[PDB]
mmCIF file of C-alpha atoms and ligand atoms in Angstrom:
data_model
loop_
_atom_site.group_PDB
_atom_site.id
_atom_site.type_symbol
_atom_site.label_atom_id
_atom_site.label_comp_id
_atom_site.label_asym_id
_atom_site.label_seq_id
_atom_site.Cartn_x
_atom_site.Cartn_y
_atom_site.Cartn_z
ATOM 1 C CA UNK L 2 135.422 188.251 39.779
ATOM 2 C CA UNK L 3 138.679 190.356 39.902
ATOM 3 C CA UNK L 4 138.512 192.995 37.304
ATOM 4 C CA UNK L 5 142.132 193.009 36.045
ATOM 5 C CA UNK L 6 144.735 190.472 34.907
ATOM 6 C CA UNK L 7 148.469 190.841 35.477
ATOM 7 C CA UNK L 8 150.571 191.179 32.337
ATOM 8 C CA UNK L 9 154.194 190.128 31.893
ATOM 9 C CA UNK L 10 155.213 193.816 31.859
ATOM 10 C CA UNK L 11 154.034 194.143 35.468
ATOM 11 C CA UNK L 12 150.932 196.195 34.666
ATOM 12 C CA UNK L 13 147.327 195.180 35.212
ATOM 13 C CA UNK L 14 144.834 195.022 32.327
ATOM 14 C CA UNK L 15 141.021 195.192 32.731
ATOM 15 C CA UNK L 16 139.532 191.900 31.575
ATOM 16 C CA UNK L 17 136.573 193.595 30.024
ATOM 17 C CA UNK L 18 137.002 196.342 27.392
ATOM 18 C CA UNK L 19 134.886 198.145 24.812
ATOM 19 C CA UNK L 20 135.433 197.260 21.162
ATOM 20 C CA UNK L 21 135.319 200.042 18.559
ATOM 21 C CA UNK L 22 135.566 198.390 15.116
ATOM 22 C CA UNK L 23 132.534 199.491 13.061
ATOM 23 C CA UNK L 24 131.432 202.006 15.698
ATOM 24 C CA UNK L 25 130.326 204.929 13.524
ATOM 25 C CA UNK L 26 132.266 208.122 14.067
ATOM 26 C CA UNK L 27 129.087 209.991 14.889
ATOM 27 C CA UNK L 28 128.193 207.458 17.587
ATOM 28 C CA UNK L 29 131.482 206.295 19.083
ATOM 29 C CA UNK L 30 132.199 209.420 21.163
ATOM 30 C CA UNK L 31 128.930 208.891 23.078
ATOM 31 C CA UNK L 32 129.544 205.134 23.234
ATOM 32 C CA UNK L 33 132.917 205.600 24.916
ATOM 33 C CA UNK L 34 131.561 208.313 27.242
ATOM 34 C CA UNK L 35 128.732 206.008 28.332
ATOM 35 C CA UNK L 36 131.128 203.085 28.686
ATOM 36 C CA UNK L 37 133.431 205.044 31.003
ATOM 37 C CA UNK L 38 130.424 206.334 33.003
ATOM 38 C CA UNK L 39 129.168 202.781 33.599
ATOM 39 C CA UNK L 40 132.546 201.360 34.568
ATOM 40 C CA UNK L 41 134.594 200.427 31.508
ATOM 41 C CA UNK L 42 138.264 201.156 31.960
ATOM 42 C CA UNK L 43 139.652 199.527 28.786
ATOM 43 C CA UNK L 44 138.976 200.628 25.194
ATOM 44 C CA UNK L 45 140.186 198.610 22.197
ATOM 45 C CA UNK L 46 141.105 200.833 19.247
ATOM 46 C CA UNK L 47 142.950 200.744 15.946
ATOM 47 C CA UNK L 48 144.110 203.252 13.347
ATOM 48 C CA UNK L 49 142.524 201.164 10.582
ATOM 49 C CA UNK L 50 139.098 201.558 12.258
ATOM 50 C CA UNK L 51 139.155 205.249 11.163
ATOM 51 C CA UNK L 52 137.495 206.479 14.371
ATOM 52 C CA UNK L 53 140.350 207.060 16.819
ATOM 53 C CA UNK L 54 139.885 210.849 16.747
ATOM 54 C CA UNK L 55 136.289 210.422 17.947
ATOM 55 C CA UNK L 56 137.238 207.780 20.525
ATOM 56 C CA UNK L 57 139.852 210.251 21.742
ATOM 57 C CA UNK L 58 137.319 213.049 22.129
ATOM 58 C CA UNK L 59 135.428 210.836 24.603
ATOM 59 C CA UNK L 60 138.527 209.781 26.519
ATOM 60 C CA UNK L 61 139.739 213.362 26.805
ATOM 61 C CA UNK L 62 136.372 214.648 27.943
ATOM 62 C CA UNK L 63 136.109 212.034 30.676
ATOM 63 C CA UNK L 64 139.647 212.829 31.820
ATOM 64 C CA UNK L 65 138.877 216.558 31.765
ATOM 65 C CA UNK L 66 135.566 215.909 33.696
ATOM 66 C CA UNK L 67 137.655 213.894 36.234
ATOM 67 C CA UNK L 68 135.342 210.934 35.856
ATOM 68 C CA UNK L 69 138.588 208.932 35.690
ATOM 69 C CA UNK L 70 142.244 209.410 35.989
ATOM 70 C CA UNK L 71 144.555 208.480 33.102
ATOM 71 C CA UNK L 72 146.273 205.842 35.243
ATOM 72 C CA UNK L 73 142.919 204.078 35.676
ATOM 73 C CA UNK L 74 142.349 203.730 31.914
ATOM 74 C CA UNK L 75 143.839 201.005 29.754
ATOM 75 C CA UNK L 76 143.879 202.170 26.130
ATOM 76 C CA UNK L 77 144.880 199.698 23.412
ATOM 77 C CA UNK L 78 145.636 200.382 19.764
ATOM 78 C CA UNK L 79 147.254 198.544 16.889
ATOM 79 C CA UNK L 80 149.887 199.165 14.200
ATOM 80 C CA UNK L 81 148.311 198.691 10.775
ATOM 81 C CA UNK L 82 149.847 196.422 8.131
ATOM 82 C CA UNK L 83 151.046 199.260 5.855
ATOM 83 C CA UNK L 84 153.326 200.550 8.645
ATOM 84 C CA UNK L 85 155.556 197.437 9.114
ATOM 85 C CA UNK L 86 158.690 199.319 8.302
ATOM 86 C CA UNK L 87 161.360 200.553 10.670
ATOM 87 C CA UNK L 88 160.957 204.115 9.594
ATOM 88 C CA UNK L 89 157.142 204.151 9.784
ATOM 89 C CA UNK L 90 156.315 202.482 13.147
ATOM 90 C CA UNK L 91 156.952 205.476 15.397
ATOM 91 C CA UNK L 92 154.937 207.850 13.259
ATOM 92 C CA UNK L 93 152.048 205.378 13.069
ATOM 93 C CA UNK L 94 152.046 205.102 16.848
ATOM 94 C CA UNK L 95 152.287 208.877 17.213
ATOM 95 C CA UNK L 96 149.335 209.438 14.859
ATOM 96 C CA UNK L 97 147.281 207.091 17.016
ATOM 97 C CA UNK L 98 148.469 208.904 20.151
ATOM 98 C CA UNK L 99 147.612 212.285 18.677
ATOM 99 C CA UNK L 100 144.158 211.097 17.566
ATOM 100 C CA UNK L 101 143.347 209.462 20.947
ATOM 101 C CA UNK L 102 144.527 212.593 22.842
ATOM 102 C CA UNK L 103 147.109 210.527 24.741
ATOM 103 C CA UNK L 104 150.886 210.724 25.630
ATOM 104 C CA UNK L 105 151.112 206.958 25.943
ATOM 105 C CA UNK L 106 149.215 203.794 25.101
ATOM 106 C CA UNK L 107 148.790 201.078 27.690
ATOM 107 C CA UNK L 108 149.195 198.425 24.984
ATOM 108 C CA UNK L 109 150.162 198.611 21.320
ATOM 109 C CA UNK L 110 149.679 195.551 19.119
ATOM 110 C CA UNK L 111 150.980 194.419 15.751
ATOM 111 C CA UNK L 112 147.462 194.247 14.254
ATOM 112 C CA UNK L 113 148.157 191.388 11.832
ATOM 113 C CA UNK L 114 151.442 189.552 11.287
ATOM 114 C CA UNK L 115 151.469 190.549 7.570
ATOM 115 C CA UNK L 116 153.184 193.691 6.339
ATOM 116 C CA UNK L 117 151.781 195.420 3.241
ATOM 117 C CA UNK L 118 153.278 197.963 0.852
ATOM 118 C CA UNK L 119 153.199 201.431 2.499
ATOM 119 C CA UNK L 120 151.003 204.119 1.057
ATOM 120 C CA UNK L 121 147.626 205.720 1.449
ATOM 121 C CA UNK L 122 145.631 202.530 0.854
ATOM 122 C CA UNK L 123 145.173 200.221 3.834
ATOM 123 C CA UNK L 124 144.927 197.191 1.504
ATOM 124 C CA UNK L 125 147.186 197.876 -1.515
ATOM 125 C CA UNK L 126 146.251 195.392 -4.225
ATOM 126 C CA UNK L 127 147.833 194.199 -7.432
ATOM 127 C CA UNK L 128 145.754 194.297 -10.607
ATOM 128 C CA UNK L 129 144.523 190.750 -9.847
ATOM 129 C CA UNK L 130 143.332 191.598 -6.362
ATOM 130 C CA UNK L 131 146.108 190.110 -4.247
ATOM 131 C CA UNK L 132 147.462 192.234 -1.402
ATOM 132 C CA UNK L 133 150.893 193.673 -2.151
ATOM 133 C CA UNK L 134 153.292 192.519 0.594
ATOM 134 C CA UNK L 135 156.129 194.314 2.318
ATOM 135 C CA UNK L 136 159.439 192.435 2.561
ATOM 136 C CA UNK L 137 159.705 193.461 6.297
ATOM 137 C CA UNK L 138 159.380 190.353 8.622
ATOM 138 C CA UNK L 139 157.609 189.999 12.080
ATOM 139 C CA UNK L 140 160.972 190.030 13.878
ATOM 140 C CA UNK L 141 162.057 193.394 12.523
ATOM 141 C CA UNK L 142 158.579 194.752 13.162
ATOM 142 C CA UNK L 143 158.855 193.485 16.743
ATOM 143 C CA UNK L 144 162.168 195.270 17.233
ATOM 144 C CA UNK L 145 160.452 198.488 16.148
ATOM 145 C CA UNK L 146 157.690 197.834 18.710
ATOM 146 C CA UNK L 147 160.334 197.360 21.420
ATOM 147 C CA UNK L 148 161.733 200.801 20.602
ATOM 148 C CA UNK L 149 158.338 202.335 21.356
ATOM 149 C CA UNK L 150 158.523 200.955 24.920
ATOM 150 C CA UNK L 151 162.022 202.398 25.244
ATOM 151 C CA UNK L 152 160.826 205.820 24.059
ATOM 152 C CA UNK L 153 157.923 205.969 26.504
ATOM 153 C CA UNK L 154 155.189 205.957 23.856
ATOM 154 C CA UNK L 155 153.669 202.648 24.985
ATOM 155 C CA UNK L 156 153.691 200.757 28.301
ATOM 156 C CA UNK L 157 153.241 197.305 26.767
ATOM 157 C CA UNK L 158 153.543 195.749 23.333
ATOM 158 C CA UNK L 159 151.854 192.707 21.889
ATOM 159 C CA UNK L 160 150.566 190.920 18.837
ATOM 160 C CA UNK L 161 147.247 190.103 17.213
ATOM 161 C CA UNK L 162 146.170 187.308 14.888
ATOM 162 C CA UNK L 163 149.525 185.570 15.358
ATOM 163 C CA UNK L 164 149.391 181.803 14.983
ATOM 164 C CA UNK L 165 151.258 179.361 17.145
ATOM 165 C CA UNK L 166 154.364 179.369 15.006
ATOM 166 C CA UNK L 167 154.407 183.153 14.734
ATOM 167 C CA UNK L 168 154.158 183.578 18.500
ATOM 168 C CA UNK L 169 157.005 181.073 18.814
ATOM 169 C CA UNK L 170 159.057 183.090 16.235
ATOM 170 C CA UNK L 171 158.613 186.179 18.390
ATOM 171 C CA UNK L 172 159.572 184.261 21.608
ATOM 172 C CA UNK L 173 162.642 182.750 19.884
ATOM 173 C CA UNK L 174 163.800 186.077 18.390
ATOM 174 C CA UNK L 175 167.560 186.535 18.767
ATOM 175 C CA UNK L 176 168.129 189.328 21.203
ATOM 176 C CA UNK L 177 164.441 189.569 22.229
ATOM 177 C CA UNK L 178 164.107 192.493 24.630
ATOM 178 C CA UNK L 179 160.428 192.437 25.578
ATOM 179 C CA UNK L 180 158.126 189.463 25.291
ATOM 180 C CA UNK L 181 154.674 190.131 23.824
ATOM 181 C CA UNK L 182 152.287 190.924 26.660
ATOM 182 C CA UNK L 183 149.127 189.950 24.763
ATOM 183 C CA UNK L 184 147.990 188.038 21.691
ATOM 184 C CA UNK L 185 144.555 189.328 20.630
ATOM 185 C CA UNK L 186 142.708 186.687 18.594
ATOM 186 C CA UNK L 187 139.185 185.844 17.530
ATOM 187 C CA UNK L 188 137.556 183.608 20.147
ATOM 188 C CA UNK L 189 133.989 182.546 20.880
ATOM 189 C CA UNK L 190 132.031 179.258 21.198
ATOM 190 C CA UNK L 191 132.258 178.536 17.448
ATOM 191 C CA UNK L 192 135.990 179.137 17.324
ATOM 192 C CA UNK L 193 137.171 178.131 20.788
ATOM 193 C CA UNK L 194 140.924 178.407 20.132
ATOM 194 C CA UNK L 195 141.978 175.806 22.745
ATOM 195 C CA UNK L 196 145.310 175.024 21.139
ATOM 196 C CA UNK L 197 146.477 178.592 20.568
ATOM 197 C CA UNK L 198 145.210 179.695 23.957
ATOM 198 C CA UNK L 199 147.035 176.933 25.826
ATOM 199 C CA UNK L 200 150.274 177.734 23.930
ATOM 200 C CA UNK L 201 150.028 181.408 24.657
ATOM 201 C CA UNK L 202 148.992 181.022 28.298
ATOM 202 C CA UNK L 203 151.828 178.469 28.877
ATOM 203 C CA UNK L 204 154.236 181.219 27.774
ATOM 204 C CA UNK L 205 152.722 183.854 30.012
ATOM 205 C CA UNK L 206 151.151 185.793 27.192
ATOM 206 C CA UNK L 207 147.608 187.039 28.024
ATOM 207 C CA UNK L 208 145.020 186.308 25.347
ATOM 208 C CA UNK L 209 142.327 188.831 24.414
ATOM 209 C CA UNK L 210 139.217 187.421 22.728
ATOM 210 C CA UNK L 211 137.842 189.554 19.929
ATOM 211 C CA UNK L 212 134.462 189.162 18.207
ATOM 212 C CA UNK L 213 133.134 187.401 21.340
ATOM 213 C CA UNK L 214 129.531 187.818 20.139
ATOM 214 C CA UNK L 215 130.371 186.568 16.659
ATOM 215 C CA UNK L 216 130.534 190.042 15.124
ATOM 216 C CA UNK L 217 126.917 190.113 13.843
ATOM 217 C CA UNK L 218 127.629 193.516 12.212
ATOM 218 C CA UNK L 219 130.623 192.281 10.314
ATOM 219 C CA UNK L 220 130.240 193.713 6.729
ATOM 220 C CA UNK L 221 130.526 190.264 5.061
ATOM 221 C CA UNK L 222 127.861 188.569 7.156
ATOM 222 C CA UNK L 223 125.534 186.249 5.210
ATOM 223 C CA UNK L 224 122.035 185.293 6.395
ATOM 224 C CA UNK L 225 126.055 182.001 8.805
ATOM 225 C CA UNK L 226 125.802 180.598 12.371
ATOM 226 C CA UNK L 227 124.620 183.075 15.004
ATOM 227 C CA UNK L 228 125.893 182.860 18.553
ATOM 228 C CA UNK L 229 123.413 185.324 19.904
ATOM 229 C CA UNK L 230 120.521 183.313 18.446
ATOM 230 C CA UNK L 231 121.861 179.842 19.266
ATOM 231 C CA UNK L 232 119.022 178.384 21.463
ATOM 232 C CA UNK L 233 121.678 176.190 23.306
ATOM 233 C CA UNK L 234 123.454 179.367 24.459
ATOM 234 C CA UNK L 235 120.128 181.074 25.099
ATOM 235 C CA UNK L 236 119.250 178.166 27.390
ATOM 236 C CA UNK L 237 122.398 178.617 29.478
ATOM 237 C CA UNK L 238 121.620 182.323 29.662
ATOM 238 C CA UNK L 239 118.039 181.687 30.764
ATOM 239 C CA UNK L 240 119.213 179.287 33.482
ATOM 240 C CA UNK L 241 121.428 182.052 34.901
ATOM 241 C CA UNK L 242 118.854 184.827 34.423
ATOM 242 C CA UNK L 243 121.320 186.639 32.123
ATOM 243 C CA UNK L 244 121.316 187.630 28.467
ATOM 244 C CA UNK L 245 123.005 185.527 25.800
ATOM 245 C CA UNK L 246 125.504 188.329 25.292
ATOM 246 C CA UNK L 247 126.325 188.296 29.021
ATOM 247 C CA UNK L 248 127.028 184.543 28.822
ATOM 248 C CA UNK L 249 129.188 185.083 25.736
ATOM 249 C CA UNK L 250 131.207 187.733 27.618
ATOM 250 C CA UNK L 251 131.529 185.788 30.876
ATOM 251 C CA UNK L 252 132.698 182.668 28.990
ATOM 252 C CA UNK L 253 136.147 184.022 27.972
ATOM 253 C CA UNK L 254 136.531 185.742 31.346
ATOM 254 C CA UNK L 255 136.425 182.339 33.058
ATOM 255 C CA UNK L 256 139.091 181.048 30.656
ATOM 256 C CA UNK L 257 141.466 183.724 31.974
ATOM 257 C CA UNK L 258 141.000 185.783 28.823
ATOM 258 C CA UNK L 259 140.406 189.469 28.315
ATOM 259 C CA UNK L 260 137.284 190.170 26.219
ATOM 260 C CA UNK L 261 136.317 193.244 24.170
ATOM 261 C CA UNK L 262 132.654 193.221 23.047
ATOM 262 C CA UNK L 263 131.681 196.111 20.777
ATOM 263 C CA UNK L 264 128.512 198.137 21.052
ATOM 264 C CA UNK L 265 127.310 201.631 20.241
ATOM 265 C CA UNK L 266 123.953 201.008 21.933
ATOM 266 C CA UNK L 267 123.994 202.591 25.407
ATOM 267 C CA UNK L 268 121.753 199.973 26.975
ATOM 268 C CA UNK L 269 123.916 197.159 25.605
ATOM 269 C CA UNK L 270 127.137 198.870 26.670
ATOM 270 C CA UNK L 271 125.740 198.743 30.189
ATOM 271 C CA UNK L 272 124.375 195.176 29.830
ATOM 272 C CA UNK L 273 127.698 193.875 28.682
ATOM 273 C CA UNK L 274 129.422 195.266 31.744
ATOM 274 C CA UNK L 275 127.122 193.456 34.179
ATOM 275 C CA UNK L 276 129.103 190.229 34.032
ATOM 276 C CA UNK L 277 130.908 190.318 37.453
ATOM 277 C CA UNK L 278 127.983 188.976 39.598
ATOM 278 C CA UNK L 279 127.456 185.429 38.166
ATOM 279 C CA UNK L 280 129.449 182.297 37.455
ATOM 280 C CA UNK L 281 129.172 179.734 34.694
ATOM 281 C CA UNK L 282 129.662 176.210 36.047
ATOM 282 C CA UNK L 283 132.438 173.954 34.769
ATOM 283 C CA UNK L 284 129.705 172.003 32.951
ATOM 284 C CA UNK L 285 128.482 175.251 31.349
ATOM 285 C CA UNK L 286 132.031 176.063 30.299
ATOM 286 C CA UNK L 287 132.658 172.635 28.790
ATOM 287 C CA UNK L 288 129.264 172.745 27.093
ATOM 288 C CA UNK L 289 130.065 176.127 25.511
ATOM 289 C CA UNK L 290 133.465 174.805 24.419
ATOM 290 C CA UNK L 291 131.698 171.877 22.752
ATOM 291 C CA UNK L 292 130.130 174.252 20.208
ATOM 292 C CA UNK L 293 133.435 174.802 18.426
ATOM 293 C CA UNK L 294 133.187 174.505 14.663
ATOM 294 C CA UNK L 295 136.376 176.369 13.639
ATOM 295 C CA UNK L 296 134.247 179.364 12.278
ATOM 296 C CA UNK L 297 136.023 182.707 11.763
ATOM 297 C CA UNK L 298 134.554 186.172 11.492
ATOM 298 C CA UNK L 299 137.959 187.545 10.505
ATOM 299 C CA UNK L 300 139.609 186.169 7.534
ATOM 300 C CA UNK L 301 140.347 187.793 4.193
ATOM 301 C CA UNK L 302 140.787 186.109 0.829
ATOM 302 C CA UNK L 303 142.863 188.925 -0.717
ATOM 303 C CA UNK L 304 145.581 188.357 1.886
ATOM 304 C CA UNK L 305 145.780 184.512 1.882
ATOM 305 C CA UNK L 306 148.905 184.234 -0.280
ATOM 306 C CA UNK L 307 150.928 186.648 1.845
ATOM 307 C CA UNK L 308 153.849 184.653 3.255
ATOM 308 C CA UNK L 309 152.772 185.529 6.807
ATOM 309 C CA UNK L 310 148.994 185.095 6.460
ATOM 310 C CA UNK L 311 148.160 183.403 9.765
ATOM 311 C CA UNK L 312 145.247 181.048 8.974
ATOM 312 C CA UNK L 313 144.658 177.869 7.030
HETATM 313 N N1 NDP D 423 142.579 192.407 16.374
HETATM 314 C C1 NDP D 423 141.737 192.197 15.351
HETATM 315 O O1 NDP D 423 142.105 191.817 14.236
HETATM 316 C C2 NDP D 423 140.283 192.437 15.613
HETATM 317 C C3 NDP D 423 139.846 193.118 16.725
HETATM 318 N N2 NDP D 423 138.516 193.233 16.998
HETATM 319 C C4 NDP D 423 138.113 194.032 18.197
HETATM 320 O O2 NDP D 423 137.147 193.291 18.914
HETATM 321 C C5 NDP D 423 135.942 194.088 19.049
HETATM 322 C C6 NDP D 423 134.731 193.198 19.171
HETATM 323 O O3 NDP D 423 134.551 192.401 17.991
HETATM 324 P P1 NDP D 423 133.490 192.767 16.844
HETATM 325 O O4 NDP D 423 133.974 192.062 15.624
HETATM 326 O O5 NDP D 423 133.268 194.244 16.781
HETATM 327 O O6 NDP D 423 132.139 192.055 17.260
HETATM 328 P P2 NDP D 423 131.348 191.612 18.614
HETATM 329 O O7 NDP D 423 131.408 190.133 18.671
HETATM 330 O O8 NDP D 423 131.812 192.424 19.751
HETATM 331 O O9 NDP D 423 129.857 191.969 18.177
HETATM 332 C C7 NDP D 423 129.479 193.358 17.976
HETATM 333 C C8 NDP D 423 128.046 193.335 17.522
HETATM 334 O O10 NDP D 423 127.212 192.782 18.582
HETATM 335 C C9 NDP D 423 126.165 193.684 18.886
HETATM 336 N N3 NDP D 423 125.894 193.624 20.311
HETATM 337 C C10 NDP D 423 126.716 194.089 21.315
HETATM 338 N N4 NDP D 423 126.246 193.857 22.514
HETATM 339 C C11 NDP D 423 125.067 193.209 22.285
HETATM 340 C C12 NDP D 423 124.084 192.727 23.174
HETATM 341 N N5 NDP D 423 124.198 192.886 24.504
HETATM 342 N N6 NDP D 423 123.002 192.152 22.627
HETATM 343 C C13 NDP D 423 122.915 192.032 21.274
HETATM 344 N N7 NDP D 423 123.763 192.438 20.355
HETATM 345 C C14 NDP D 423 124.843 193.030 20.925
HETATM 346 C C15 NDP D 423 126.640 195.045 18.413
HETATM 347 O O11 NDP D 423 125.521 195.872 18.105
HETATM 348 P P3 NDP D 423 125.440 197.448 18.432
HETATM 349 O O12 NDP D 423 126.839 198.011 18.364
HETATM 350 O O13 NDP D 423 124.497 197.918 17.349
HETATM 351 O O14 NDP D 423 124.826 197.551 19.820
HETATM 352 C C16 NDP D 423 127.452 194.692 17.157
HETATM 353 O O15 NDP D 423 126.591 194.515 16.040
HETATM 354 C C17 NDP D 423 136.006 194.987 17.816
HETATM 355 O O16 NDP D 423 135.104 196.073 17.858
HETATM 356 C C18 NDP D 423 137.478 195.401 17.833
HETATM 357 O O17 NDP D 423 137.655 196.353 18.859
HETATM 358 C C19 NDP D 423 137.587 192.621 16.208
HETATM 359 C C20 NDP D 423 137.995 191.975 15.056
HETATM 360 C C21 NDP D 423 139.336 191.894 14.732
HETATM 361 O O1 LDT D 424 141.048 193.590 11.323
HETATM 362 C C1 LDT D 424 140.283 194.017 12.194
HETATM 363 O O2 LDT D 424 140.581 194.440 13.345
HETATM 364 C C2 LDT D 424 138.775 194.039 11.890
HETATM 365 O O3 LDT D 424 138.510 193.962 10.504
HETATM 366 C C3 LDT D 424 138.859 195.020 9.724
HETATM 367 C C4 LDT D 424 138.778 196.348 10.179
HETATM 368 C C5 LDT D 424 139.047 197.355 9.277
HETATM 369 F F1 LDT D 424 138.946 198.630 9.741
HETATM 370 C C6 LDT D 424 139.371 197.148 7.965
HETATM 371 C C7 LDT D 424 139.430 195.824 7.528
HETATM 372 C C8 LDT D 424 139.209 194.766 8.391
HETATM 373 C C9 LDT D 424 139.374 193.374 7.879
HETATM 374 S S1 LDT D 424 138.836 192.958 6.339
HETATM 375 N N1 LDT D 424 139.990 192.547 8.698
HETATM 376 C C10 LDT D 424 140.269 191.162 8.393
HETATM 377 C C11 LDT D 424 141.704 190.948 7.953
HETATM 378 C C12 LDT D 424 142.610 191.989 7.749
HETATM 379 C C13 LDT D 424 143.941 191.748 7.411
HETATM 380 C C14 LDT D 424 144.360 190.437 7.289
HETATM 381 BR BR1 LDT D 424 146.195 190.110 6.962
HETATM 382 C C15 LDT D 424 143.504 189.371 7.462
HETATM 383 C C16 LDT D 424 142.187 189.664 7.802
HETATM 384 F F2 LDT D 424 141.337 188.635 8.012
#
């Protein structure tokens, strides 16, 4: 299968990237180095993950080694919720750039639609545990993202965890200058996202599937459904002489999605890349879709009253 998808900014995005949430800072430099050595050309990052400096060390070393050229990499990061303010967006982007050892990002996303009170804390709470909102809306935040394109800091801008109506808000913005290139959302067989995907794809927005393996290392896991252990998925894998993870990665690829599995295990980083030499049948695809149960890895009770919280 073709390795890249065309975005609505004219650039091409690798359909398979390496996730970095939860990758320990003492492991992620090697993980990214290994990933680039074995063929990854897309790394998914975020300031809130607290490991961009270490991701950047890997990127810079592989550029310096001339393993890759900068033009061949596709580096994604995300604006955290406490930086939804006109006067904070550029500096947030620049901190990410400085940490990643880059002079531009290929794609910069609004990480969540909700803005929070600025300050040192990533989740400022009131004394009853509710997140403290910012008054700044997604349209004004989008305008600030557009400025980053116009300043050369980012080649593409997009959104993440935006629901149907929030995507529509963005698309209907008065004076919209750049459409979102991508909406990055949770997507896997237990949360198949058909409705949001069809909306987004119909508008030309590329969808990236996060937590494609069901985020088994998520910190709030309970002893919960498990994609990797689901014998029905294991059976499809066995039929194709592939691992369950490889099936879970190939699945979104055949839906015209980008997918960003995370690993810090070198053998798995390599395993997860070996997904371009087999095809799931239409029956396999429909069977995997049938496992939907509307189950989310990423949700957060403290944020559910924010006006712009995306999920119900
Ligand atoms: N925009 C957003 O709001 C969000 C974005 N994301 C992005 O998506 C990425 C992927 O999602 P994430 O939630 O991390 O979870 P994933 O679904 O990618 O699962 C990661 C887990 O699966 C394990 N694993 C990886 N490969 C294999 C394999 N071949 N066999 C068995 N186990 C395997 C990893 O273990 P190990 O590392 O020990 O090998 C880790 O515990 C994130 O890292 C982040 O970049 C995720 C959530 C939210
Ligand atoms: O968010 C990620 O990329 C991965 O997850 C995280 C990664 C981090 F580095 C810190 C917190 C999260 C959490 S708790 N994320 C869920 C979450 C955050 C904000 C809102 Br609005 C809703 C929500 F569901």
